[PDB]
Structure formats: structure tokens, C-alpha cells
């Protein structure tokens, strides 16, 4: 399909967890906090 990320915004960094865009790393890491601070997940389990 005509899908794609590049559009709404062109940021150098990107969150491989959710998919957020950031201008500077410091910002990205600061966000990852909400990612590296919650119970883990599992495939078709729990």
C-alpha cells in the first residue's frame, strides 16, 4: 500500500518501541523512560 512514516515530520531519531519522532537524542532517551519502566510483554501469552 501507499504507507510510509516520512511525512508528518522528518526527525533524525525514532523510537523503535512506539514510533515517535525526536529532534535530539537527549529527548528520545528521556521518552524511552516510559518504555524501560513497565512490565514486559509476550506473544499470544498473558
Give residues in contact with Zn ion (CB under 5 A). 15, 17-18, 20
Q: How far is the CB of 23 from Zn ion (least distance, A)?
A: 15
C-alpha distances out from residue 28 to 1, 19, 37, 41, 42, Å: 29, 11, 15, 21, 24
Q: How far is the CB of 10 from Zn ion (least distance, A)?
A: 18
CB-nearer residue toward Zn ion: 2 or 38: 38
Helices (H), the chain: 25-32
Q: How far is the CB of 43 from Zn ion (least distance, A)?
A: 20
Amino acid at each position: 500500500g501507499s504507507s510510509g512514516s516520512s511525512g508528518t515530520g522528518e526527525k533524525p531519531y525514532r523510537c523503535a518501541e512506539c514510533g515517535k519522532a525526536f529532534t535530539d537524542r537527549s529527548n528520545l532517551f528521556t521518552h524511552q523512560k516510559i518504555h524501560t519502566g513497565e512490565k514486559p510483554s509476550g506473544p499470544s501469552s498473558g
